[PDB]
Amino acid sequence: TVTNEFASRFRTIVATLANVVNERAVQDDMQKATRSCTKQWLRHLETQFD
Amino acid sequence: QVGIPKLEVDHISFSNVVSMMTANIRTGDDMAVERVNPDDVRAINIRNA
Amino acid sequence: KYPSKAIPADELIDNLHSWMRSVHLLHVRSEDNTLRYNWMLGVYARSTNYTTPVGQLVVNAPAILNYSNPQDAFNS
Amino acid sequence: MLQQPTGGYTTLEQFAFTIRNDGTNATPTQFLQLLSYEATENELVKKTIPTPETHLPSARNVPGNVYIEDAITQALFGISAQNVNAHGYFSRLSALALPNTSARLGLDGVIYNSETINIPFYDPAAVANFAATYAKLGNASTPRYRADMIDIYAHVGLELAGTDAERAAGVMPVKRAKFDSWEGSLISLSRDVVNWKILAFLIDLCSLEGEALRAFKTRNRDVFRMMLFIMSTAVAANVVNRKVTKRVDRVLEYIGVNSMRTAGRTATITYDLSRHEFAAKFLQLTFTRWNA
Amino acid sequence: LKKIAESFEDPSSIVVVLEFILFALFFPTEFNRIKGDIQNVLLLFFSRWYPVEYGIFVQRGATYTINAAGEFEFSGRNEKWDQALYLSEHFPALFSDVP
Amino acid sequence: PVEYGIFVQRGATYTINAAGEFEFSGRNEKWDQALYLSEHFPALFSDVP
Ligand SMILES: Nc1nc2c(ncn2[C@@H]2O[C@H](COP(=O)(O)OP(=O)(O)OP(=O)(O)O)[C@@H](O)[C@H]2O)c(=O)[nH]1
């Protein structure tokens, strides 16, 4: 009635991708930023997809 | 027997096979490409190659 | 500082020590007993301050310095 | 389909191998008789040739009928060939490797994807034996499978310059070849050799077995030596002429020593690095079959 | 594939990986048609982000060929994919799903 | 400079361990405020002699 397997799959996908991006070691401060911004953006994409 | 090469001897031969490229070949025509510059100058390693 | 005479042992030791305190090679300690540490690549990376591609590889993946079979340490 | 005799395809007059010389179609043996060798202080000893790799390179999906004999002969003796490993159509030989493949190797030296009318072709079993080995030319460029291109030339020297005692010994002095010579003699020699239908030789070389094989190896020793000669001139460090009282002796230094040279020269064909790797591979395989 | 030139230095470059994941979802068929060509991009991704695992993987081989009885046979040899290989026996090895 | 090299060899940042011990990075990186919610702390303020 409510849950959608497709959307929820994309949700585990972006979960994995956020774990991937989170473990990405970086040296520059700006890269450090774009990492966390990238994570927020993934959390956005999941809602568009759902 | 293999044939005698024509330049080995002094007779003139007036019918000869000439290889020729066809319409499907073309040489020296200018050619198009997609150049793609690096996203950051500071990401470009010069060495150790 | 001492053009004509031996460096007094106290100064030699204290400077050598403070400089030893200054050094820290990147590494990922592990429990495998077969493992070694690629001293050459680590000290090199450190010397270039991790700017060379090897220094990048090391600053991001220090574990790459650890190795069992000696050759693979570089193949990696 | 061409039947293969109890001897090789090489027994057929259709496949005679003959360099031009003194205005006639000379056999390779009667050219090699002209050759004479000055010894030098250096010695060649022949190391064991490494066993060729088990791998047969993929015959990539190719719609076309590859002209293979032309590719091989030009890669070995061709005056102008280069980047021979760029295209990598040598791998195509492994299409012939399979049992009951549709593909045929024509006497034309072309690898047809399917049997086609009015094109005579070698017996498929023979070609399969031949492809099981020579398809490995297709991996002459890949780093894992490259042949040594220095030590192998020792064998070349022994198989060319070497006296029967030097051959039994496995060690001969490095030699310096020479012969009475016409202008452009090595260019003309190499071009007489590019026209040779060498797949006949390689196919009999891989298919024949028993006494029938050994009887081949004696009969075609001089042919193999002519191929080796052209390669030798291709890799020789220098190729001078000598005045000898209104006669000229061409002289190459040195037999059996690859100088690794790649800059072109008028006197002889030149190997680009790709031709070196290829020729090294070819020698690896061919000498492997030749000594078994 | 309409080739990307991505080097995958910045974290944001995960975007390109995502561009493929979505494509593999919305269009699995077309994806499967171009997947070797997208493996060439992914390899630049893995060699930066996961150099150790990348070395182990590529050491196993960049491609494989299923044989008789269905076993995979990885090449053991790193080599760039070309769409010339799509009609051949070879497969991109990122998609082998062999642990 | 000397004290600096000794300090920064230890690491620009640290993380408190679940066991409570500090664990310095051993790296010299510029801090970003994205790090403020991260596990890491600036090492100047560790108060570890
Ligand atoms: N930078 C650096 N160079 C090294 C290291 N280890 C070996 N080398 C260099 O690599 C070169 C080759 O190594 P070796 O096979 O030991 O050569 P070597 O000349 O016999 O070295 P010696 O023991 O000094 O006689 C040597 O010249 C060393 O200077 C290292 O850990 N770091």
Q: Which residue type occupies D136? A: K
User: Coil, strand or helix: which one is D273?
Assistant: helix
* Contact by Cβ (8 Å): F14, F24: yes
Angle between the N-to-C axes of helices D153-160 and D273-290, in degrees from 0 to 180, rounded to the nearest 10: 60
Tokens (6 digits) for D30: 């009667």
Please, which residues have CB within 8 angstroms of residue C27's CB and are 6 or more apart in sequence? Answer: C37, C42, C62, C65, C66
Q: Which two tokens stand for residue D28?
A: 């390779």
Q: Does the CB of E56 have a partner CB in chain A at under 8 Å?
A: no
Cis peptide upstream of residue D89 (ω within 30 degrees of 0)? no
Name all chains with 3 or more CB-CB pairs below 8 Å to chain B.
C, D, E
**Cα D112 to Cα D98: distance, rounded to the nearest angstrom:** 14
Which residues lie below 8 Å from residue B28, measured CB to CB, with a gap of 6+?
Answer: none
The torsion of the CA quartet D264, D226, D277, D184, rounded to 10 degrees, works out to 10
Query: Residues D236, D240, D244, D247: is their CA dihedral positive or negative?
Result: positive
- How many Cβ pairs within 8 Å bridge chains A and F? 15
Taking alpha carbons only, the member of D143, D174, D148 closest to residue D160 is: D174
SS3 per-residue string spanning chain A: CCCCHHHHHHHHHHHHHHHHHHCCCCCCHHHHHHHHHHHHHHHHHHHHHC
Residue A29's beta-bridge partner residues? none
Give me the phi and psi of E6, to 5 degrees please. -60, 135
Q: How far apart are CA D137 and CA D88, in angstroms?
A: 9
Pocket test residue of C37, C40, C74 for ligand 1, highest count of atoms within 8 A of CB: C40
Resolution in angstroms comes to 3.0
Q: Which of residues 35-94 of E touch C (CB under 8 A)?
A: 48, 51-52, 55, 59
CA distance C37 to C66: 5
| Residue keyed to tokens 């002796």 | D249
For residue D88, what are its two tokens?
Answer: 């990598």
Give the integer Cα–Cα distance in Å for D192 and D179. 17
Name all contacts of E56-60 with Cβ < 8 Å and 24+ positions apart: E57/E93, E59/C75, E60/E93
> What is the CA(C43)–ligand 1 centre distance, in A?
13
> Of A41, A12, F22, whose CA–CA distance to A33 is shortest?
A41
Mutate to test the interface with F, among C21, C29, C60 (most CBs of F within 10 A): C21
> In whole angstroms, what is the distance from residue D195 CA to residue D114 CA?
25
Helix residue ranges per DSSP H, D252-291 = 273-290
Read out DSSP for E41-76?
Answer: HHHHHHHHH-HHHHHHHHHH-SEE---GGG-----S
Q: Which residue has the tokens 């680009």?
A: D272
Q: Are strands F22-24 and D171-180 parallel, antiparallel or unpaired?
A: unpaired
Q: Which two tokens stand for residue E61?
A: 């081989």
Q: What gap in Å lies between CA E83 and CA B22, rounded to an integer? A: 27
Give ∠ CA F23-F25-F26 in degrees, rounded to 5.
115
| Measured distance CA(E9)–CA(E57) in Å, rounded | 20
Provide DSSP, F17-48. -TTS-EEE--------GGGGGSSEEEGGGS--
Q: Which two tokens stand for residue D64?
A: 């076309």
Q: Residue holding tokens 């010994």?
A: D169
DSSP three-state, residue F8: helix
DSSP D265: B
Put simply, the answer to whether D60 touches E77 (Cβ < 8 Å) is no
Residues of F in contact with C26 (CB under 8 A): 26-27
Q: Which residue has the tokens 């959307």?
A: A7
The number of the ligand 1 atom at minimal distance from the alpha carbon of C43 is: 32
Q: Which residue has the tokens 């081989």?
A: E61
Structure tokens at D50: 């490494």
Give SS3 for F5: helix
Q: Nearest-CA neighbor of E2 among E12, E10, E23, E14?
A: E23
Amino acid at E29: T
Q: Angle at CA F41, nearest 5°, toward F35 and F45? A: 140
Q: Do the Cβ atoms of D279 and D234 come closer than 8 Å? A: yes
CA–CA separation, E84 and D208 (whole Å): 36
Q: How far is the CA of E71 from the CAs of D175, E39, E67, E68, in angstroms?
A: 53, 21, 6, 7
| Short-list E50, E77, E52, CA closest to E63 | E77
Distance CA B16, CA B4 (A): 13
Beta bridge partners of D255: D175
Name the helix (H) or strand (E) containing D72: helix D68-77
User: What residues pair up with D253 in beta bridges, in sequence order?
Assistant: D176, D238
CA distance E35 to E29: 10
The answer to whether B5 faces chain D, any CB pair under 8 Å, is: yes
Interface test with E, best of B34, B36, B39, B42 (most E CBs within 10 A): B39
Task: Inspect the structure and tell me whether chains C and F have 3 or more CB pairs less than 8 Å apart.
Answer: yes
Distance C40 CA to ligand 1 centre (A): 9
Locate D227 and state its tokens. 């191929």
Q: Phi then psi for E64, rounded to 5 degrees?
A: -145, 170
Q: Separation of B39 CA from ligand 1 center, angstroms?
A: 38
3-state secondary structure at position C8: coil
CA torsion, points B2, D234, D40, D246, in degrees to nearest 10? 60
Pairs of residues, one from chain C and one from chain E, whose beta carbons lie less than 8 Å apart: 14
Residues C22, F2: C-beta atoms closer than 8 Å: yes
Contacts of C63 in chain E (CB under 8 A): 52
Q: Three-state DSSP class for D99?
A: coil
Alpha-carbon gap, residue A42 to E33, rounded angstroms: 27
Bridge partners, residue D105, by sequence:
D111
- Tokens at residue D77, please? 């003796």
Give residues preceding each break in chain B, C–N over 2.5 A.
none
Neighbours of B11 (CB within 10 A): 7
Is D58 within 8 Å of D94 (Cβ atoms)?
Answer: yes
Residue of D161, D149, D168 whose CA lies nearest to D42: D161
In the reported structure, the alpha carbon of residue D73 is separated from the centroid of ligand 1 by a whole-number distance in angstroms of 46
Interchain touch E–D (≥3 Cβ pairs closer than 8 Å): yes
b/e code E9-48 from CB counts within 10 Å (16+ = b): bbbbbbebbbebbebeeeeeeebeebbbbbbbbbbbbbbb
Least Cα distance to D81 among D279, D217, D246 occurs for D279
CA dist., res. B5 & res. E74, Å (int): 51
Residue D95 and residue D132 in contact, taking contact as beta carbons nearer than 8 Å: no
Longest dimension (CA), chain C: 51
Q: The dihedral of CA D207, D212, D217, D220: what is its sign? A: negative
All residues of chain C having their beta carbon less than 8 Å from the beta carbon of residue B46 are none
Q: Check residue D121 and report its DSSP letter.
A: B
CA dihedral A20, A25, A31, A33 (to 10 degrees): 70
Residue with tokens 């498929």: D124
Radius of gyration of chain E (CA): 14
Cα F24 to Cα C24, C56, D124, F28, F42, distances in angstroms: 12, 20, 71, 11, 10
Which method was it determined by?
cryo-EM
Q: How far apart are CA C40 and CA E9, in angstroms?
A: 25
Interface test with A, best of E7, E9, E10, E49 (most A CBs within 10 A): E10
In sequence order, the β-bridge partners of residue D239 are D252
The tokens describing D178, both together, are 């020479």
**In terms of Cα–Cα distance, which of D274, D237, D281 is closest to D78?**
D274
What number of residues does chain A have? 50
